[PDB]
């Protein structure tokens, strides 16, 4: 029975900072990759960031290129997202997804409002 | 972000551009040129086109004639049965999908394509296991026709269903490959929930390598008018039947392993689709040899045609 | 009303219930049971399935061999060419449409199905005109010291068949879905004066059907007082020409008769199963002809085996 | 160049009567059939009535069964529709169509408001 916690996030002022979390439970964590995906108000899902199973090579969207940074802990089953120098459009509900896809396992999410 | 995994699928093409779609929901013309999909459908037509008559006539001639009941003929009928299940069960779906550009039937449409194509190759392989044992027993003669061969045909259908069925059950799954026109065992995505990683080890060793050991074991024993030809030409054809099998299925089997190891690496849709569709000649190539080499059958084939 | 006419179509099923839809826009499963549409697609598969190899091999064997250049072989190649144009041009569309239940391709999809199926029957008919003339000239011998022409006789068939099948595509007449709305054919139903299909049907029946039959039975009428090499090559070939017509009359009369019945009784109470049976039955025109060329003419059958069993 | 006139029709009170007209031009009239079709406000077209080319056998919808009656003049190229004992729902825009179909040549018709 798979479970993905969606810790970290809340209300932050423009040009601020925020470090999200994604605790994994009930599967071989380091044998899969993990991504971050957000849900803007009105607009469709955006694939934010992604990283390999080992964690060597991270990839970001052009939207949040360089500003955001993704990193994972294989030992403690966690995926972080240090979001820095935020903007108004980054206002969204953030989810962490498995594999390489935008399909989201059910998660608490996190209301990141900028 | 080299490939694009989904619940059902894995598209070997990055979804940074945002173009990637499910190969059950929409066509995959962004993977390769639209004419390359018609090239598949054209190629796939000829497999169905020359597949049915050769397999049907070979089935007809074998059953019609009360003669021709040597184990060789039983297995080459067994293939002809399976090869028809390929042409109707599998090849129809891929020919239809090749046109549309995606599995418009749905996830079950993929299962058909993979299942019967998996049977065809495994039933053909486990048949070459039986033939290798049969040619061994006659030549080397450890023991001082229509019985053992019939049980040897039961062996192939038992062992092939140990390969192709479990994907349908739950252990492993069938997933679109390359251009997303064919299907096959999930090498690309671990999908631990399904446990396809464990199945691939199972499939390669137990379904494929074990046979190859048994075939080359039996071939290793044979290193040192009727009986002088029926022993030679038949055992010679058994070798040519394997040689053709090794040409056919190694391309796919090698690429399948490459992808199994390098999951998430940078590879395109043309990588797998070439050796995947090449391996679908398994329907036709086997009973071409049975006509081409074995002249005994060729004579009795003409009896059925030219009455 | 009894039927249901539209801009493109005519559905032989009343639209009082409000169920009737265009056979280009939506499926026609209200006409007959859904499995009956799969019965067409299944049947239509076998026409394509046994069509390609027999026509292709017959084309291959005739061209491969420098021998076998008698007028009989030229025409039976000419058929094999047309029969492939049937299988690829026409039969693909109907097999695809039979599955979906409607011409999902569109109005042009209908044109394909009707066009190449019209050619196949006309090229076969005008070929039997040439054969009837050829068997007449050899037996009765109207021109002395006589016995190239076949190649010009093949040009005759393609000229005359295109005088039938092409005009619908141009404007004079049109191709319209028939019966279950899976096949197509010449508009016997709607007058469509704008198209002038009423005038074409008279044209098609007389000029593209009846006139041939007169010429065939005219030439057959010459061989009434009549009926190793010359005693068999005269007999068996001329015998096969008759069997080739006999099969044609079995094949195309069902459709040709029903087409006339509908041409007379436009708007009468008839269902979708009425026309679709003789329509799809006539699509055996692809396969039946070069079965006889193998079955009867053993001379070819020997040389066919040469190509197969090399 | 085909042309269908749509004479007759206007404002009439409930339970009234009205006789429509449809003058044909530029085709062999008596060689095909003609129908009547109406356009209610909001809802789709309704096939009202139809008749054979000769004019022998008329057919009506269940909606206007018996109340309406259709008749044609082959000599003068005309089709009539004696609509009697009208109702509120008969409020529509009436067209006369060719063949047996609902496709309407020309347009405008006649504003029959009850
Ligand atoms: C066989 O028989 C069946 C049933 O008897 C028949 O099906 C009907 O086909 C007609 C078309 O031939 C359909 O009518 C159309 O409906 C359109 C909208 O209707 C939908 O929404 C309503 C909801 O109210 C549903 O009940 C309905 O089922 C539909 O889903 C309508 O837009 C069409 O008409 C407008 O557009 C045409 C084209 O431009 C125009 O010519 C019309 O005049 C009309 O525009 C309006 O005109 C008025 C008058 O000038 C104007 O004031 C108004 O502003 C315009 N409209 C607006 C608001 O913009 C059309 O009527 C009908 O829905 C079908 N019924 C079914 C099955 O649902 C088949 O056609 C028959 N088969 C054949 C063809 O043989
Ligand atoms: C490859 O990458 C592309 C990148 O775009 C992916 O495409 C996106 O897929 C996501 C999948 O969820 C889509 O997100 C959903 O959009 C719905 C609306 O889409 C339509 O309307 C918007 C209007 O704003 C248009 O912009 C858009 O084009 C569509 O016409 C929303 O309604 C969905 O929200 C609902 O469902 C989600 C489920 O997760 C809930 O969380 C929400 O609360 C809500 O109930 C959702 O946001 C997104 O629209 C797609 N983008 C595009 C291009 O339209 C591909 O999916 C990906 N490839 C594959 C198939 O894996
Ligand atoms: C739908 O199809 C039916 C069946 O074909 C059509 O019925 C035909 O209707 C005409 C007109 O009523 C009949 O003509 C009359 O026949 C009688 C007896 O034969 C004759 O005495 C009259 O002088 C006249 O000619 C016709 O017979 C009848 N067909 C039969 C026998 O069923 C019907 O007309 C069609 N519907 C439409 C919209 O036209
Ligand atoms: C896409 O595939 C490329 C090529 O296989 C990957 O690039 C490799 O990245 C690893 C580290 O993750 C390096 O050790 C290799 O040397 C790279 N290969 C070379 C030489 O190009 C890339 O990481 C893949 N991207 C993702 C995230 O799937
Ligand atoms: C075109 C459709 C295909 C290739 C579907 C499935 C094929 C397989 C699962 C093939 C695997 C193997 C076979 C059949 C033959 C021996 C090697 C093998 C186990 C990799
Ligand atoms: C399945 C599709 C079909 C049958 C399409 C068209 C067929 C015709 C237009 C056939 C008409 C006739 C032929 C070919 C043979 C002689 C009689 C004919 C003119 C009625």
Residue numbers in the entry:
A (entry chain D), D (entry chain C): 1 to 114
B (entry chain B): 1 to 144, 149 to 228, 241 to 323
C (entry chain A): 1 to 147, 151 to 230, 241 to 323
Structure paper excerpt:
Rhodopsin (Rho), composed of seven transmembrane domains, a characteristic of all G protein-coupled receptors (GPCRs), and its covalently bound chromophore 11-cis-retinylidene, is a major component of the intracellular disk membranes of rod photoreceptor cells. Upon photoisomerization of its chromophore from 11- cis- to all-trans-retinylidene, the photoactivated rhodopsin (Rho*) undergoes a complex sequence of structural changes, leading to the signaling state of the receptor, metarhodopsin II (Meta II). Crystal structures of Nb2 in complex with native rhodopsin reveal a mechanism of allosteric modulation involving extracellular loop 2 and native glycans. Nb2 binding suppresses Schiff base deprotonation and hydrolysis and prevents intracellular outward movement of helices five and six – a universal activation event for GPCRs.
The asymmetric unit of these crystals contained a parallel bRho dimer, like previously observed bRho dimers, with Nb2 bound to both protomers at their extracellular surfaces. Inspection of the bRho/Nb2 interface revealed close contacts of CDR1 and CDR3 of Nb2 with the C-terminal region of EL2 of bRho. Glu197 of EL2 and Glu201 located at the top of TM5 also formed electrostatic interactions with Arg98 of CDR3 and Lys31 of CDR1 of Nb2. The placement of these six critical residues of Nb2 near the extracellular surface of bRho revealed a binding “hot spot” on EL2 consisting of Pro194, His195, Glu196, and Glu197. Collectively, the crystal structure of the bRho/Nb2 complex together with our validating mutagenesis and biochemical studies confirm the discontinuous conformational epitope of bRho, which consists primarily of EL2 and N-terminal glycans. The structure of the ground-state bRho/Nb2 complex was virtually identical to that of bRho alone. We show out that CDR2, CDR3, and, surprisingly, the FR2 loop of Nb2 maintain extensive interactions with Rho’s native glycans in the three crystal structures.
